[PDB]
Amino acid sequence: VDELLKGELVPENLTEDQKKKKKEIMEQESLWKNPDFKGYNKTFQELHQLSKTFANNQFRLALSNYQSGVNTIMKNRDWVEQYRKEEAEKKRLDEKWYWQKVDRKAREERVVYREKMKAKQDALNYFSKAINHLDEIKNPDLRERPEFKRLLSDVYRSWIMAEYDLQNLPQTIPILELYIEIDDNEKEYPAHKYLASAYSFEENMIKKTKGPDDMLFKYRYKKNVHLLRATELKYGKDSPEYKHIVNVINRDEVISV
Amino acid sequence: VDELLKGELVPENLTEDQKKKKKEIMEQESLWKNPDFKGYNKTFQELHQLSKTFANNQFRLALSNYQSGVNTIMKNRDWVEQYRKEEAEKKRLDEKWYWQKVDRKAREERVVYREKMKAKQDALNYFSKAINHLDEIKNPDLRERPEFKRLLSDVYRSWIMAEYDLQNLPQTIPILELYIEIDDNEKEYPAHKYLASAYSFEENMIKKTKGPDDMLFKYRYKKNVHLLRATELKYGKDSPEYKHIVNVINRDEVISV
């Protein structure tokens, strides 16, 4: 069941009465046909944003960027694999000591990490524009279609994974809570795994900067809940992993006796 | 069967239909004759590297270096034989002690060893240039011809023999492994004798510098594998010499009882 098979949100092409109604309106537009008309009042013209034609172009605008953003992620991995293969296939005629191998190995790792960060930034820019376009569709009905929820989650997912590598953990928390509200994305442990790692960073900053205890408990409480849910989705209840996490959470959290 | 008898990689000059295609393309370039043309984008021009004439020039470039580099080894041996001959022919009119002869003898051995290390480096420079020319051919079809495998193995063999004279054992390991994967070169015992020594040198340095045991086990294992393989290819299996090496390897390695 590929929602993105056709690459569109709502198809465009039946009542006899409506057919006559659409015909007489077309007569009026022929009388007032003025391609140079520019409405001083923008309210009437903006009603076109509620039409299916406007939403069809916005969906493909996001799809155009989503293809570009994911490609740069994939094209980088192609270059990452090729670069490792290329270096192992060239001859080191000025290398005889073990530390020289480590010195050469260090430079190769610097280049890979340097290029990966450049690729994660380019992909984030493309995914950022996709999020903007998918949020300017003002018709709630066109948002509930399976095609929309399929692309919306995909745009959110690849944006969070790319952003998280940029060490921008606090930024991903609001987006992740939007991801787990789309159909059955809540039943994914990776979504709760990222939230547990992201909320732990926020707790450290409050402790490091000696912030209020109220924000310390709130960021701590969200960490355990999303960590506990992540374990259950992957290992289930009454398992050796789940029992271990409860002791860690119970030890960390506050209990009243 | 001399692969390098003709001094080329692949000979170059049929179908009338193919002969007709070559006619129209050749006439197309007649109109667009411009020797001063320089392509801004090199991708189209870089495809010339796949042409047969490109490989013929690369092969004869590498072949030219091999002849010069091998000449350095041969000329050095000719002079060393000549230099030693002249030394015994000149009259020592001011020598009447045994210790004087030893000092005079030590002078010649210093001069000869001085010239050899000079000759090997000059030869090693040429063999390095030959290697680079062979590695800039990107046609796998032309990489399996008898002419190609003859020169690639001959260059490596003369390169490693020159490298080992300069006490550069650790550099020989990557070249040796690529040598034993061409035609039936793995059947040669000398190619396994140098592998035995090279992995023994790396065994000492890791032990001397108190490095990880993981690199020690890997280099020790490679030494025993190729030390035993070399004896098997020369003195044969189930031979008294082969029995002796099994005693050393079992003594040197780790056995779990």
């Binding site: 005629l93 000025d94 | 090693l124 420079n125 390095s128 240039k129």
Partner: protein, 56 residues
């Protein structure tokens, strides 16, 4: 690489870890100084000429 203290192909520089090697590095560093001195001679030569041209 240009001064002769490094091999443009092998890419290995001079080493002193041997008594015999160190005796051969004295000779190389002498010709290394000759090239640096030769280059500074030309830069000084142009500068004096450029000085005269500006005055004229």
């Amino acid at each position: 690489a240009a001064l002769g203290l490094r091999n443009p192909t092998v890419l290995t520089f001079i080493s002193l870890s041997t008594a015999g090697k160190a005796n051969s590095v004295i000779g190389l560093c002498d010709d290394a100084l000759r090239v640096i001195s030769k280059q500074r001679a030309d830069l000084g030569a142009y500068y004096n000429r450029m000085e005269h041209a500006a005055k004229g």
